[PDB]
């Protein structure tokens with residue numbers, strides 16, 4: 109969005125903590141001070157971790173923000189982020205996100221890092237990451253996921269780090285990692301996996317670290333790790349093999 113007349117920071121950003129962040133960023137004396145769209149356009153990063161922010165309403169007016177560090181707040185809604193097309197790094201770790209709108213990330217074509225760890229996500233909508241062609245890092249650890257939709261990572265061809273640890277996954281679709289040919293780190297530890305699908309890691313030729321610790325695996329398929337020629341670290345501890 110855009111403002112056509114100078115407007116008080118608190119009018120645009122209703123959350124007092126977030127308004128304070130904007131005030132500090134723009135070097136203003138008070139959150140009641142008026143700002144211009146040109147000043148809002150000058151913002152390319154917001155660092156506000158552990159700031160008790162409940163809402164980022166108003167962020168829609170910052171077209172140029174590229175780095176958004178909002179870890180450790182009280183966010184439940186991130187719909188205001190949808191049209192921030194210049195976003196490259198989004199840290200939403202440790203908030204109170206329970207669900208993700210299906211198309212909330214559809215416009216973030218420049219996003220390379222997405223940290224959604226330590227939230228309370230119970231599911232991933234099909235295609236929620238479909239347009240994140242530039243993504244290299246996806247951290248979904250410490251959530252409440254029980255299953256992954258097939259194809260949920262299929263367009264993330266440039267992904268190098270995928271952290272799915274500390275969830276409650278009880279299965280893995282067979283071709284769920286099929287397109288991640290550049291993946292170097294895959295963390296599946298602390299889940300409830302009892303078996304691994306045949307060929308589940310077949311195409312991860314760049315993989316160097318695979319963590320499957322703290323699951324409930326009783327058996328490993330024959331040659332399940334055979335095509336991982338660059339594998340350097342394989343953690344299988346605390347299972348039932």
Ligand SMILES: [Cl-]
Nearest residue numbers: 198199200223
């Ligand atoms: Cl981060």
